Design an enzyme around this catalytic site. Structure first.
Site, PDB file in Angstrom:
ATOM      1  N   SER A  45     -12.457 -20.056  -5.233  1.00 25.72           N
ATOM      2  CA  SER A  45     -11.073 -19.932  -4.771  1.00 25.72           C
ATOM      3  C   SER A  45     -11.041 -20.270  -3.305  1.00 25.72           C
ATOM      4  O   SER A  45     -10.097 -20.865  -2.854  1.00 25.72           O
ATOM      5  CB  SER A  45     -10.531 -18.517  -4.858  1.00 25.72           C
ATOM      6  OG  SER A  45     -10.541 -18.047  -6.180  1.00 25.72           O
ATOM      7  N   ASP A  92      -6.483   6.607  -4.932  1.00 19.62           N
ATOM      8  CA  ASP A  92      -6.003   5.263  -5.053  1.00 19.62           C
ATOM      9  C   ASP A  92      -6.017   4.787  -6.499  1.00 19.62           C
ATOM     10  O   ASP A  92      -6.293   5.549  -7.397  1.00 19.62           O
ATOM     11  CB  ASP A  92      -6.634   4.320  -4.032  1.00 19.62           C
ATOM     12  CG  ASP A  92      -8.034   3.827  -4.324  1.00 19.62           C
ATOM     13  OD1 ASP A  92      -8.673   3.086  -3.592  1.00 19.62           O
ATOM     14  OD2 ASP A  92      -8.487   4.212  -5.456  1.00 19.62           O
ATOM     15  N   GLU A 145       0.768  -1.217   0.000  1.00 16.49           N
ATOM     16  CA  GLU A 145       0.000   0.000   0.000  1.00 16.49           C
ATOM     17  C   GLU A 145       0.813   1.288   0.000  1.00 16.49           C
ATOM     18  O   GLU A 145       0.331   2.327  -0.421  1.00 16.49           O
ATOM     19  CB  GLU A 145      -0.881   0.036   1.251  1.00 16.49           C
ATOM     20  CG  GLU A 145      -1.896  -1.089   1.324  1.00 16.49           C
ATOM     21  CD  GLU A 145      -3.052  -0.998   0.382  1.00 16.49           C
ATOM     22  OE1 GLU A 145      -3.822  -1.901   0.221  1.00 16.49           O
ATOM     23  OE2 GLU A 145      -3.168   0.137  -0.236  1.00 16.49           O
TER      24      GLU A 145
END
Length: 164
Positions: free
Chosen positions: A117, A20, A11
């Protein structure tokens, strides 16, 4: 290596409001402020979050404080989530870090959406799960970070970050 260092690598640290990858107003270590287009809405959320008039800027200390809250909230969120908890409980320490990372980035709801997943991870089918995770908007939009996370799930080691 630990979850904090891992996330700090993925980050970055910014002391001034920024946008972002998705164009949202963020500050510190990936702390989303608002999905709203108004910088003013952002500055308001920021002051509310810090408890002071920040004028769009915070100190290192403030950023770390927000960071501690966010990781804590991410963990607690996983533990309260009926779809996530079981996966988390089934995983080893490093892989647990990988799920925390995803939740921190994409929110509980988003990760909970990766049904197949999740099932593969629970079953410990590492290679299969890695391939499935890559078939996502997540992977296409932030490929370097996604590959790092994916390698973490695949190998159960910190290799992808020992570079960085």
């Amino acid at each position: 290596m630990n979850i904090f260092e891992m996330l700090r690598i993925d980050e970055g640290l910014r002391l001034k409001i920024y946008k972002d990858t998705e164009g949202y107003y963020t500050i510190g270590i990936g702390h989303l402020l608002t999905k709203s287009p108004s910088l003013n809405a952002a500055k308001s959320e920021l002051d509310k979050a810090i408890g002071r008039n920040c004028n769009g800027v915070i100190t290192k200390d403030e950023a770390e404080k927000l960071f501690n809250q966010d990781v804590d909230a991410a963990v607690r969120g996983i533990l309260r989530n009926a779809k996530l908890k079981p996966v988390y409980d089934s995983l080893d320490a490093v892989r647990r870090c990988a799920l925390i990372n995803m939740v921190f980035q994409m929110g509980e709801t988003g990760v909970a959406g990766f049904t197949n997943s999740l099932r593969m991870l629970q079953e410990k089918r590492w290679d299969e799960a890695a391939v499935n995770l890559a078939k996502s908007r997540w992977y296409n939009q932030t490929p370097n970070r996604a590959k790092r996370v994916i390698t973490t799930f695949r190998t159960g080691t910190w290799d992808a970050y020992k570079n960085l």
